[PDB]
Design a binder for this molecule. Structure first.
Ligand SMILES: CN(C)c1cccc2cccc(N(C)C)c12
Length: 330
């Protein structure tokens, strides 16, 4: 079996991407943020504190004939950005792009933090990291990808994210017409529950490539690219007037500047992020100070290849027994 779904940026900055997901019988269609950095499938629901819902589509398990309460199970999650959600758990049928999993754990939200309530375009998260990070207690649950693995033609999904444009998530097959050239595969460590890999270096603009190992995670759920302080300082040194700002929380640059590209290594291959992808626009409406897409990982503890890097490539997440990550230009 296979599945295929279009993913669409939520705003003009590509802050996140949403993908329609069918849940329940008859289908209730919610727009979920596919997140390779977490492993919980949770949704706004009819059990959400009414005051914490502002425009989201809610899942209503009482209107679904296949929903079953997973008795006693609860879940609680906090994300890197300080956002949080928790609640109880149903099982139900979940289909993504024609691909169906029966008995999927669907985590319903009793409480969500302020950032989730404020974002009315995101009805929930669909986690695609390894199931060992799933927060359901006392019985940890499987991700959609893990439950669908048995029925897939190939145990892979691919992320083809668009730059200010829609893109595609595919399950169970690799589209040969979606990328140029050959895919370079690199080893993944599952030690921490993430799609964790090691980049082989970087280059700023048309500068020379610096061979150096950068351990990081492939995270479709994080907007920006977060790299070690030395690398990020070398990039922003090339932009006239760029500076790190305490007030804003990261590097900013004069909006009138042109940004150089940024290259990262995947084995012997190179992925080039166009400078336009690194421009996240004015820090406030009307400001002449613009926010940068490459920021320091120093205060995070982990390097993150987020949407800024991933949207420059065709990315294969290979969930074979020995997992690997594939990168191709496009
Ligand atoms: C400056 N600013 C508004 C921001 C601050 C912190 C994180 C951000 C992440 C994505 C986009 C942003 N924009 C510039 C809108 C961010």
């Amino acid at each position: 079996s296979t599945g295929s779904a279009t993913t669409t940026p939520i705003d003009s900055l590509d802050d996140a991407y949403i993908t329609p997901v069918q849940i329940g019988t008859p289908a209730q269609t919610l727009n979920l943020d596919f997140d390779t950095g977490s492993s919980d499938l949770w949704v706004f629901s009819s059990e959400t504190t009414a005051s914490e819902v502002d425009g989201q589509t809610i899942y209503t398990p009482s209107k679904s004939t296949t929903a079953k309460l997973l008795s006693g199970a609860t879940w609680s999650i906090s994300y890197g950005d300080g956002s949080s959600s928790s609640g109880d758990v149903y099982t139900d049928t979940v289909s993504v792009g024609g691909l169906t999993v029966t008995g999927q754990a669907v985590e319903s939200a009793k409480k969500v933090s302020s950032s989730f309530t404020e974002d009315s375009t995101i009805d929930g998260l669909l986690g695609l990291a390894f199931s060992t990070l799933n927060t359901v207690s006392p019985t940890q649950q499987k991700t959609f990808f893990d439950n669908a693995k048995a029925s897939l033609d190939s145990p892979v999904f691919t992320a083809d994210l668009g730059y200010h444009a829609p893109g595609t998530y595919n399950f169970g097959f690799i589209d040969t017409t979606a990328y140029t050239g050959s895919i370079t595969y690199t080893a993944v460590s599952t030690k921490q529950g993430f799609w964790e890999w090691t980049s082989t270096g970087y280059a700023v603009g048309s500068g020379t490539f610096k061979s150096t190992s950068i351990d990081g995670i492939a995270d479709t759920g994080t907007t920006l690219l977060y790299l070690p302080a030395t690398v990020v300082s070398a990039y922003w040194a090339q932009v006239s007037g760029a500076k790190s700002s305490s007030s804003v929380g990261g590097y900013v640059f004069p909006c009138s500047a042109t940004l150089p590209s940024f290259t990262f290594g995947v084995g012997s291959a190179r992925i080039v992020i166009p400078g336009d992808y690194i421009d996240f626009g004015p820090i406030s409406t009307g400001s002449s100070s613009c926010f940068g897409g490459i920021q320091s990982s120093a205060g995070i503890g982990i390097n993150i290849f987020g949407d800024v890097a991933l949207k420059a490539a065709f990315v294969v997440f290979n969930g074979a027994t020995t997992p690997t990550l594939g990168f191709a230009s496009k």
